[PDB]
Design a protein around this ligand. Structure first.
Ligand code: SF4
Ligand code: SF4
Ligand code: SF4
Lengths: 58, 198
């Protein structure tokens, strides 16, 4: 009907009534995956001893 | 104690971590080492060695492998006597005497002063080359004495020595390369040692 060529308008209009999806970083940062490769961290055993043995394998 | 001049070889001969060098302990892993072939600085044996340095600091000097010289062996002196250059007494910059005190100086100023003094002394100069010099270094010292100073007062002997020694070295040693060889030593039926504690 020539309407299909105008489908894009229907898209953009529709989206300007659905709520924006942006993550609210930094006031409301998004949920990064649990598996994410963030900053390396050096950990300790429960008594406080450093886990690292300095083997340089890392 | 173990007490052998060749003890380090055991560290290099052990196929496991049973024998380790206390000096090298926990210093580095193989991937952290810049490794280069080298020759020992210490005696005329001229052993092939492998210098390993991490962080720009030499950490060990393994025996290398040169069947015609040292097979795969060192002495403790060659293997561990490498820290001399980093004991904090090293001369980092040209130094000049002023007011009787030794002061750090530029290369330009230092060379200016050294040239002035050497030209003032002219042929009234002698060059003590010492025994801690590569063949190139000794050659430069000698050539420098011959031309730059127009003198023949050149002697690498920083030790007890004699004129008879220089005469003998001229007669039999100098210019006579690759005569007796380590391989020949191993097969010599009789070896005599004169003033020599191998
Ligand atoms: S690999 Fe070795 S040196 Fe690196 S963090 Fe783990 S224990 Fe420490
Ligand atoms: S513990 Fe040391 S000596 Fe034993 S297998 Fe591992 S690296 Fe080799
Ligand atoms: S490794 Fe030992 S025997 Fe060989 S050149 Fe060095 S000091 Fe001499």
């Amino acid at each position: 009907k020539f309407l299909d060529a105008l489908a894009g308008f229907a898209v953009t209009l529709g989206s300007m009534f659905k709520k924006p999806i942006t993550e609210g970083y930094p006031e409301k940062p998004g949920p990064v995956a649990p598996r994410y490769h963030g900053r390396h961290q050096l950990n300790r055993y429960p008594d406080g001893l450093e886990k690292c043995i300095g083997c340089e394998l890392c | 104690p173990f007490q052998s001049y060749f003890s380090g070889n055991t560290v290099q001969i052990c196929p496991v971590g049973a024998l380790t060098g206390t000096a090298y302990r926990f210093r580095a892993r193989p991937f952290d080492l810049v490794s280069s072939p080298s020759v020992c600085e210490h005696c005329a044996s001229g052993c092939a060695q492998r210098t390993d340095h991490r962080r720009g600091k030499v950490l060990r000097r393994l025996a290398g492998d040169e069947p015609e010289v040292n097979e795969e062996w060192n002495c403790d002196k060659g293997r561990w006597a490498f820290t001399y250059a980093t004991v904090g007494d090293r001369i980092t910059t040209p130094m000049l005497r002023d007011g009787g005190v030794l002061r750090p100086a530029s290369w330009s100023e230092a060379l200016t002063v050294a040239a002035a003094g050497l030209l003032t002394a002219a042929g009234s100069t002698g060059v003590l080359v010492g025994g801690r010099c590569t063949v190139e270094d000794a050659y430069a010292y000698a050539k420098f004495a011959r031309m730059v100073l127009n003198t023949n007062d050149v002697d690498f002997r920083a030790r007890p020595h004699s004129a008879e020694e220089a005469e003998f070295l001229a007669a039999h040693v100098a210019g006579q390369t690759m005569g007796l060889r380590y391989a020949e030593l191993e097969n010599a039926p009789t070896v005599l040692l004169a003033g020599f504690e191998p």
